Amino acid sequence: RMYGKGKGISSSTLPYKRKQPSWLKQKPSEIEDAIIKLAKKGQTPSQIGATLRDNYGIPQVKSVTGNKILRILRAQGIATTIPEDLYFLIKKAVSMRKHLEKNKKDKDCKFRLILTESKIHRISRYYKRKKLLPSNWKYQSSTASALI
Amino acid sequence: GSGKPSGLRAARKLRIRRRTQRWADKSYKKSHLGTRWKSNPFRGSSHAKGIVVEKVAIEAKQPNSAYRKCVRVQLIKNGKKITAFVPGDGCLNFIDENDEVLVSGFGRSGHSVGDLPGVKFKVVKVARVSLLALFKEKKEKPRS
Amino acid sequence: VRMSVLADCLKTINNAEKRGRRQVLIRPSSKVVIKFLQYMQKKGYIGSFEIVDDHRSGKIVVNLLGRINKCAVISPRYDVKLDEIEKIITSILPSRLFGHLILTTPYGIMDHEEARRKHTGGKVLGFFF
Amino acid sequence: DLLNPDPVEESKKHKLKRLIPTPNSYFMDVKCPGCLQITTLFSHAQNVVLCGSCNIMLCQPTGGKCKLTEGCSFRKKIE
Amino acid sequence: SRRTKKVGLTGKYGTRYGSSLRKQIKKIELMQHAKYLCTFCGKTATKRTCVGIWKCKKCKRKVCGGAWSLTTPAAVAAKSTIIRL
Amino acid sequence: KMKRTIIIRRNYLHYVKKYNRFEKRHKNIPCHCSPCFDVKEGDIVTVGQCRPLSKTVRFNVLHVEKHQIFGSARKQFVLF
RNA sequence: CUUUUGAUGUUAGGGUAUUGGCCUAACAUGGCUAUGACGGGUAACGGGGAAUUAGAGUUCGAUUCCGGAGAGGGAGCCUGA
RNA sequence: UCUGGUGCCAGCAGCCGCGGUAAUUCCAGCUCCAAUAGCGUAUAUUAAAAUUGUUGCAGUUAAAACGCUCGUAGUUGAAUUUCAAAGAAUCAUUCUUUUUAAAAUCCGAUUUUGUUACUUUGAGUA
RNA sequence: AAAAUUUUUUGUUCUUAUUUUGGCUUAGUUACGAUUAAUAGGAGUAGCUUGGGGACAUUCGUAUUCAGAUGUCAGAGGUGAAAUUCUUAGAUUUUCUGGAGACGAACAACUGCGAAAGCAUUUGUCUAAAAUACUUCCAUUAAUCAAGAACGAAAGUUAAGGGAGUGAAGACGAUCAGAUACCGUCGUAAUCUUAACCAUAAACUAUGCCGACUAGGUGUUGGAUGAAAGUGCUUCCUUCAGUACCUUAUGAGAAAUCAAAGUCUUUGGGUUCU
Ligand SMILES: [Mg+2]
Ligand SMILES: [Mg+2]
Ligand SMILES: [Mg+2]
Ligand SMILES: [Mg+2]
Ligand SMILES: [Mg+2]
Ligand SMILES: [Mg+2]
Ligand SMILES: [Mg+2]
Ligand SMILES: [Mg+2]
Ligand SMILES: [Mg+2]
Ligand SMILES: [Mg+2]
Ligand SMILES: [Mg+2]
Ligand SMILES: [Mg+2]
Ligand SMILES: [Mg+2]
Ligand SMILES: [Mg+2]
Ligand SMILES: [Mg+2]
Ligand SMILES: [Mg+2]
Ligand SMILES: [Mg+2]
Numbered sequence A: 001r002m003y004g005k006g007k008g009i010s011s012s013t014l015p016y017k018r019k020q021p022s023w024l025k026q027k028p029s030e031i032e033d034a035i036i037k038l039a040k041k042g043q044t045p046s047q048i049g050a051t052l053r054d055n056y057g058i059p060q061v062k063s064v065t066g067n068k069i070l071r072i073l074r075a076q077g078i079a080t081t082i083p084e085d086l087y088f089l090i091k092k093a094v095s096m097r098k099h100l101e102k103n104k105k106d107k108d109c110k111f112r113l114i115l116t117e118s119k120i121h122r123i124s125r126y127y128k129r130k131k132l133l134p135s136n137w138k139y140q141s142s143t144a145s146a147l148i
Numbered sequence B: 001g002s003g004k005p006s007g008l009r010a011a012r013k014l015r016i017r018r019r020t021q022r023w024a025d026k027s028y029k030k031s032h033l034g035t036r037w038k039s040n041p042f043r044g045s046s047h048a049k050g051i052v053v054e055k056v057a058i059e060a061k062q063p064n065s066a067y068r069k070c071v072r073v074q075l076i077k078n079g080k081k082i083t084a085f086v087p088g089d090g091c092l093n094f095i096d097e098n099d100e101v102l103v104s105g106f107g108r109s110g111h112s113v114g115d116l117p118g119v120k121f122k123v124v125k126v127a128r129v130s131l132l133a134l135f136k137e138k139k140e141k142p143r144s
Numbered sequence C: 001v002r003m004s005v006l007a008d009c010l011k012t013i014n015n016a017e018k019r020g021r022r023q024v025l026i027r028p029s030s031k032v033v034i035k036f037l038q039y040m041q042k043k044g045y046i047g048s049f050e051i052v053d054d055h056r057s058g059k060i061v062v063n064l065l066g067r068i069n070k071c072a073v074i075s076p077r078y079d080v081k082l083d084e085i086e087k088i089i090t091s092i093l094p095s096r097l098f099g100h101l102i103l104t105t106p107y108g109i110m111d112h113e114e115a116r117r118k119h120t121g122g123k124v125l126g127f128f129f
Numbered sequence D: 001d002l003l004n005p006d007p008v009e010e011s012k013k014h015k016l017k018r019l020i021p022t023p024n025s026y027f028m029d030v031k032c033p034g035c036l037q038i039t040t041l042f043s044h045a046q047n048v049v050l051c052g053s054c055n056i057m058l059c060q061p062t063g064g065k066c067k068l069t070e071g072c073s074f075r076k077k078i079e
Numbered sequence E: 001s002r003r004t005k006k007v008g009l010t011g012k013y014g015t016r017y018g019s020s021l022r023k024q025i026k027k028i029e030l031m032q033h034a035k036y037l038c039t040f041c042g043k044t045a046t047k048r049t050c051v052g053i054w055k056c057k058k059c060k061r062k063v064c065g066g067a068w069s070l071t072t073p074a075a076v077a078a079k080s081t082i083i084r085l
Numbered sequence F: 001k002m003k004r005t006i007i008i009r010r011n012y013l014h015y016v017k018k019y020n021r022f023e024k025r026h027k028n029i030p031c032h033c034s035p036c037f038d039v040k041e042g043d044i045v046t047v048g049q050c051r052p053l054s055k056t057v058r059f060n061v062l063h064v065e066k067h068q069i070f071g072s073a074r075k076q077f078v079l080f
Numbered sequence G: 001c002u003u004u005u006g007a008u009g010u011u012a013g014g015g016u017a018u019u020g021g022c023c024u025a026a027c028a029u030g031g032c033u034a035u036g037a038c039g040g041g042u043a044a045c046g047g048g049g050a051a052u053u054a055g056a057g058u059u060c061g062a063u064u065c066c067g068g069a070g071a072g073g074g075a076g077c078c079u080g081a
Numbered sequence H: 001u002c003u004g005g006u007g008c009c010a011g012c013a014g015c016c017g018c019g020g021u022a023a024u025u026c027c028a029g030c031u032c033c034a035a036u037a038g039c040g041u042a043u044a045u046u047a048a049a050a051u052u053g054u055u056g057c058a059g060u061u062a063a064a065a066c067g068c069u070c071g072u073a074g075u076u077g078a079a080u081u082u083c084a085a086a087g088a089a090u091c092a093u094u095c096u097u098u099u100u101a102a103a104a105u106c107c108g109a110u111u112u113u114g115u116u117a118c119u120u121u122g123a124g125u126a
Numbered sequence I: 001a002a003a004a005u006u007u008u009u010u011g012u013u014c015u016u017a018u019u020u021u022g023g024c025u026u027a028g029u030u031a032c033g034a035u036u037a038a039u040a041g042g043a044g045u046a047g048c049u050u051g052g053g054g055a056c057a058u059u060c061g062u063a064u065u066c067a068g069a070u071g072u073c074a075g076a077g078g079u080g081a082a083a084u085u086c087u088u089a090g091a092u093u094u095u096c097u098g099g100a101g102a103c104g105a106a107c108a109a110c111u112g113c114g115a116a117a118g119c120a121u122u123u124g125u126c127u128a129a130a131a132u133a134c135u136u137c138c139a140u141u142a143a144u145c146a147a148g149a150a151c152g153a154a155a156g157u158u159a160a161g162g163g164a165g166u167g168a169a170g171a172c173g174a175u176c177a178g179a180u181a182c183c184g185u186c187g188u189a190a191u192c193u194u195a196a197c198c199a200u201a202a203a204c205u206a207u208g209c210c211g212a213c214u215a216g217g218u219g220u221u222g223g224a225u226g227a228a229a230g231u232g233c234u235u236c237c238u239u240c241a242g243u244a245c246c247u248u249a250u251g252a253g254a255a256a257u258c259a260a261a262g263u264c265u266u267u268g269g270g271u272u273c274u
């Protein structure tokens, strides 16, 4: 782990075959249409992948089509201005900041908030090094609450 | 790893550490300190001249028992006073109240030697004649 | 983190050889490991070896002949001129009549005798007795 | 020996520790009584899956494999 | 530039009265001269007008509070007790 | 920040014999820039030596290459 | 840290055997620095070299040759390539 | 482990030590050892010192892991893009000869096809 | 659209067309155009998943002590032995009713959680953290870190509260040659709460952090897979993550001893401090 002491190794592992399974019947066109329709309802890419795995029968999107979910989302200009994992980090930070504003003796929350903000700054630097964020993107710790 | 950096661009760190850690060596710090020109009666010389002021006797250390013969000398060079040992059997009888003597080190440059406590000097000449040639008693006589 | 795959491979080979294991496995592979293994094979220090294909970095199984004394890397790849080989081999090798010091050279990977034969220098990789 | 492990032993290790990594999950066809419809389902599902005709639950998410509705029959999808 | 290192607000008292007394004065008058949230209109524009009266500059409602702050913990606790019941 | 005059930084590695390793080093150079070019803090320029033009200037710029950085110009390391 | 009294640049002149804040006037706010600026110390002139060392290194070089500086301490000047 | 004198005195001894009435160590006689027209002593410096450690030290108890975590500079960073093949001259080995994608300069023939670090060979040098 | 030459309309001012250079709109054609998915990392989704992790509010227990009652009579405490002390104005002892402050026994372990310091009565509300499962998303986003930052037992300092028990200081009674001590009777600060400081401990595993490899057995805490005795719950098997112990090392040490303190004159995986 990056901060604590954990050493777990749980993960998913892909099969050896890279081609689509022989029993699958869909065409790439309606698969992309399903991606777009499902993203219109307000789901993140990871949620979209999970829903396609469970509610429809598609083991991997990249096996059927040739692209990944984020690329086909960006092909129509639908991707969010702020990447997903950074957004989740910001949401956690703002929630912790509110709770802390209510309770000034909770020392543990201060420690955890410091750790999350360090993570935010590191990820933001990485995204700014590529052209995925404007160069003058700062994350002030006071104006972040209104960032939808 | 073994506590050092071993990379192809880590020379400054190694250089600076070796520079800083050398000052913990006693020998290096003795030879490179600026105060040696000040706290040294000889001031870096190997020999010096002076005037005898007083004869004394000094006790030996605990397991031994004797009375060692020395003199007190005022240096011509800077006026300081030291104590020097007179070696030989009856060699103190060759020295008068205020003669001129060469003295040298005593073999352990900064340290006392053997049985005498706190003596680091040794007389070699008196009245411009050698102490050894005078103790041999067959070579020369004091310059009257 | 890893920081190197050659050092881990050679360390695993050395540890297995001290016990008489007749076979050992190397988890991460690379072209440099392949060239180094081929060179040890050429001098008759190991048997044949096999390359396994997963859709990630592959794996290797080698056959041992109870014949290696030591095989280690020199981690900082110092660059060596053609006329400095003598000092390095005097310091590193156990005799003047056997053992090999391996360099990477603009003409490929080779030991010190071949490097002298080709009139070239390079950077140091490792050695094996 | 090391190149040809016994497949009975290999099916007993962690999925990340066997010579070729292979998942333990699969896809399957589920036929629930009195519905006359075949639906594809994923072992280790995470959502609740409904029958297309009538909204009846086919599975329940858990911490491992999903729990199938009682009386249903399943069959693996071959490929 | 920063005009003062330590005393801040109490620089008007010069060198008189001793340093610890000026420290307590500073602690009190930071609270006394602040701005507070008006829970009726939502703006942060409530300021003290006398030793126990607080008035909002926007909606002009008057609230009875403490002497140097708008609320005091002893009243907060009693009110919370009653509301819980 | 001057009028028709810029400062450039050069990076290089220095070799130490006793430890068989290297170091990072730098030196600054004031140059003259003509109004025919358009530079900003972060670009790469090529300069040529001329006769003394002031107390500190002996080079002036002949070619500009657009380049984008992400921190401060004094913190980047490039060797060419 | 430097910059009132030239510190860093621009324009126009003066001066010199020539370039140059080398100097004068107007104008702009620059220049260096933890990769150690600005200071303190040296019983410090630099180098070709010397002593000891298996290989690494450690220490010395006022003094045959080359370069620099001075003629008790400072500052001015004539003749003259 | 020879002969006289002194007797914790006088003295010697770089270090360990010797000397209090039978001293192989002080003062002398004799005899031996070492280097030798040379041999002692003082101060500085090098090896000895893997006791300053890049090559090449040590950190539970001998000297030595910051009370603990975050963090900038610095140092260090997974795998992947042309891999081969077929001859000859050689006591299995060394040295080499042919080229199997593509595009731009001779009516299927010649040569050109990112920069540095790094390494090879030259020039110039009292 | 913008230009070099051909002739050109009569010694300098005098007329027209040529090819070629680069931008421009206009529709088609091309094998037209994107390396894995690390037993690296971050995010995500699921389980009536786990925990004495943190904050605020709230609830219960005997004990001790104060006060009011209650019944009876001569001692009670305390020590090696005694004294100081309390007591017919009723001590000590028993029974009941109220209030106060701290504390949370037994269960409780070579067991759990936390970066360390630390964390143990019930219930609610906030708040994070693992571990496991995964054919989810991104694609190198990482390791260690001078300067700098957060937290940091007990004691101690400032202010307002609280103040039963224990009790540095202090006062007594004993032992002793002396006893400013060890023993005993009182007892002030402190110990508890709220708001601020201080930055230290044998703050110890006297063992920095990340990665690889090397050996058998017995347990135990939390998930998951596969099989049997069941009134979709237990026992067994396999596997991941914590955590101990035993045996033995052609391994290591000066030894004690060590599963790392091993893979070191066969000496180099990365890095900070001394
Ligand atoms: Mg880290
Ligand atoms: Mg001026
Ligand atoms: Mg010289
Ligand atoms: Mg001199
Ligand atoms: Mg001379
Ligand atoms: Mg000269
Ligand atoms: Mg003179
Ligand atoms: Mg004799
Ligand atoms: Mg030495
Ligand atoms: Mg040495
Ligand atoms: Mg040596
Ligand atoms: Mg040592
Ligand atoms: Mg520690
Ligand atoms: Mg992965
Ligand atoms: Mg428990
Ligand atoms: Mg108080
Ligand atoms: Mg009390």
Ligand SMILES: [Mg+2]
Binding pocket: none
């Ligand atoms: Mg008491």
Ligand SMILES: [Mg+2]
Binding pocket: I192, I193
């Ligand atoms: Mg209190």
Ligand SMILES: [Mg+2]
Binding pocket: none
């Ligand atoms: Mg301490």
Ligand SMILES: [Mg+2]
Binding pocket: none
């Ligand atoms: Mg410690």
Ligand SMILES: [Mg+2]
Binding pocket: B002, I267
């Ligand atoms: Mg070592």
Ligand SMILES: [Zn+2]
Binding pocket: E038, E039, E040, E041, E042, E043, E056, E057, E058, E059, E060, E061
């Ligand atoms: Zn209001």
